[PDB]
Design a protein around this ligand. Sequence first.
Ligand code: HEM
Ligand code: HEM
Ligand SMILES: CNCCCc1cccc(CCc2cc(C)cc(N)n2)c1
Ligand SMILES: CNCCCc1cccc(CCc2cc(C)cc(N)n2)c1
Ligand SMILES: C[C@H](O)[C@H](O)[C@H]1CNc2nc(N)[nH]c(=O)c2N1
Ligand SMILES: C[C@H](O)[C@H](O)[C@H]1CNc2nc(N)[nH]c(=O)c2N1
Ligand SMILES: [Zn+2]
Lengths: 407, 411
Amino acid sequence: RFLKVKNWETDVVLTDTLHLKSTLETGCTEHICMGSIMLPTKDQLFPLAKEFLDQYYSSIKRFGSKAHMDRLEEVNKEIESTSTYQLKDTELIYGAKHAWRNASRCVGRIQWSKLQVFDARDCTTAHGMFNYICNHVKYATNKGNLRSAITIFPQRTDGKHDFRVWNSQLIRYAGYKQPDGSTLGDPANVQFTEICIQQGWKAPRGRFDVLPLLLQANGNDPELFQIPPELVLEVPIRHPKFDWFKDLGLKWYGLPAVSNMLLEIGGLEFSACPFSGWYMGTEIGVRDYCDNSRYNILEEVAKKMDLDMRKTSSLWKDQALVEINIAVLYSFQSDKVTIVDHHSATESFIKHMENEYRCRGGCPADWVWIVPPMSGSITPVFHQEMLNYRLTPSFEYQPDPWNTHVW
Amino acid sequence: RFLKVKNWETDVVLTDTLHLKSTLETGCTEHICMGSIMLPVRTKDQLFPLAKEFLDQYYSSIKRFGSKAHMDRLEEVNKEIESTSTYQLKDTELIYGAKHAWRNASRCVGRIQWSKLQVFDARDCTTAHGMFNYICNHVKYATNKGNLRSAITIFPQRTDGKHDFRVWNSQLIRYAGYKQPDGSTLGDPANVQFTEICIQQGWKAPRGRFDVLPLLLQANGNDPELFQIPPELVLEVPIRHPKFDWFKDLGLKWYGLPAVSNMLLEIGGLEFSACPFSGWYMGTEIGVRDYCDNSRYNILEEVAKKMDLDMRKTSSLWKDQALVEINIAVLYSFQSDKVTIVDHHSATESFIKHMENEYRCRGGCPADWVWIVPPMSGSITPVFHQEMLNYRLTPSFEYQPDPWNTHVWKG
Ligand code: HEM
Ligand code: HEM
Ligand SMILES: CNCCCc1cccc(CCc2cc(C)cc(N)n2)c1
Ligand SMILES: CNCCCc1cccc(CCc2cc(C)cc(N)n2)c1
Ligand SMILES: C[C@H](O)[C@H](O)[C@H]1CNc2nc(N)[nH]c(=O)c2N1
Ligand SMILES: C[C@H](O)[C@H](O)[C@H]1CNc2nc(N)[nH]c(=O)c2N1
Ligand SMILES: [Zn+2]
């Protein structure tokens, strides 16, 4: 019940006590582990509020103070009266920073406390949402000196007035199915790219077309907006040794900004809460470029390198994969855009674990997602035992809106 | 209850029902996942249900469930248990058991081969010298001049736990490791503790970088004894690179036969504490783990130096680059010497097919993602995008404590 985790490369052992505060469930049982599965009222709400406020007031060292008791009572009264409640600004920021802190799949959490929270709870329309989002993008981008941020739109009420951003990221490339059978641009976004045109977008049918935003305010029909290009920082991808690289026509965007998640704080559900940080290089180079169900460029790069692609055991895929990722990091760094390599990021995460075990009694972590998708065992997280559990406040998945929207 | 897993690369969905027949625990609860935790004297009381469950599986597989043969066997085993507190498996049962333990090994990517396991019954063995002889025959059979064949040798089962057979070596063939007074290590760092034991027991260590350890063998709960595997029986491969002529000068080699010998085979409640087993290597086991783990041979620096890579900023990905060349060398050398080896692309592709096949014909295939995914180039292999259910079936291979920690010395 007071659990141990061993690093197998360094024999370092940490004792986890924090897992006992785990509220939600994991998908696993004593009979089956689901560690690798992608996605396993008034009386409900007051305990949720209390749990949160208790941890809030404990974090500011006023646990069991008049302030605490008062606030606890204040919210208690509000729930009984309004069937919900509102967070003080301070709680909103605390909650968001902590939802990031508790995200077990996130390798970048060492930065958790330096998050800029933009309070967008006074927003009422989709045009307003657009303004807030452009402001977020411009701030976070910061001319390539990236800064973490989240913009928080109003909380769910009766579930009929939901704020939602339909894009999965604020900035993604469009995906169109060709008559010739293959796919142009990004296959992952084919369906969304449809629903854009299907809602009125005029698609340039190019390879790297920044998709428009599809913003839904107060449960209304969602609207289309084009992010000002001057706000969308992009990086043309070149290799520091292969001059033919450029002619592949590859570029990627600087700002990774997840927008389809649900932020949960003290029982409250913020269904529109786009958040951004900066890329780890492998996210673009390994996953975005080389996944079979994505830009799938391996064969072409390898051809250009004149590699023996006859037998899998020449490791030509591996050889190219490395070069591609050297180029991604190279380009980004050249153009002075923030990026981190998987070696540096994983090392920072280990340090972050140390700190969390030391000052918080633990750090929930999902090994399947923390270990980078290349060179797994030459990064230190590979050899690091991790305990995965769910703490709140949290970010959670939610259904795509098109499947849900009462049109 | 039905359960579905999805492959996110192909959207292929499968349904697991096999997990219902799962007996043992996982280590996970509803509130915690221990999926990346590495390691998460039995009475007649608990034994017969285990025997019956085994015998039931066995007789289903040969299409004789409920037959008189089935019923007599259950009767026979029942009687022998209460009579003698244990029981002996027929040869057919031992074989079925050992294959299935492999078949149920959720961390094993090479399971497509499971039905083709040569089982050597060593249950008549009484001494350590007898153990040495059996193991030598195993090594020679499995090696087959480089054309490797899967085998397991099975020594007598545990009785009162005071008379255990154990192979003290973690693998039948492994390189010695020696801690130097300056704190550096010569040879394989993973094997320092074991090497010291051997030296203590009287082994004369040549003290080089690739010394094949002696076998340290315990029969019938007696003190272990030392034996030197005849060198002519140990196949080794000099490592060279197909393009880098300086690679050979690094002075690297590895052995051809991966043969694990410190695990415990559990069949129908019986416990086989000495059951060395072998197959052939996936290239990354040597190339990524054995050579490039920081706590192993750790040759990344020197390979990268010789490649004259930019070793100043890690964002040069020099580590990744050297890692690939090193793994290219391992595969090239093995194929060149005609010693069976499989690359991680081929191995993972085959496991996916095996896995799908097992869902259709068995109703599931327990698999441990953390261990199935290769330690380099994870996401460009198909297992990365494959959801998997982990659960424990019997028969199974289990960990057991190192015997130097439990042994009662006779002197
Ligand atoms: C600052 C640099 C950051 C880096 C390098 C980073 C990196 C990553 C990576 C590689 C993943 C794996 C998911 C995937 O590969 O698709 C991930 C997941 C995640 N990140 Fe971070 N991230 C950063 C910032 C943030 C911020 C600012 C937030 C929220 C405020 C955040 C929240 C999350 C969450 C909730 C997940 C997992 C979502 C899920 O359950 O799938 N991250 N991150
Ligand atoms: C024939 C070719 C085989 C290949 C390529 C193969 C490959 C592997 C690999 C790479 C691992 C991961 C372990 C590590 O990385 O340290 C593994 C685990 C395992 N293998 Fe196989 N294997 C083969 C045959 C066998 C055989 C013949 C047996 C037993 C009869 C077996 C039983 C196991 C077991 C029980 C584990 C997991 C051990 C644990 O719980 O840590 N494998 N296998
Ligand atoms: C595929 N699983 C769901 C994807 C949703 C998601 C949530 C959080 C992060 C990511 C990866 C994109 C990303 C986002 C952020 C803020 C930083 C980063 N480095 N990378 C995806
Ligand atoms: C401390 N326990 C050491 C043994 C752990 C282990 C069990 C099973 C397989 C392995 C990997 C070595 C191996 C064994 C076999 C039979 C085949 C193979 N490719 N690779 C390690
Ligand atoms: C802590 C972590 O589970 C440990 O390092 C595991 C990770 N996955 C692995 N996978 C394989 N095949 N072999 C290993 O030794 C390990 N080690
Ligand atoms: C099925 C498996 O869970 C799936 O492929 C996961 C594996 N680990 C991952 N890890 C990261 N960082 N990102 C991912 O998208 C995935 N996908
Ligand atoms: Zn689990």
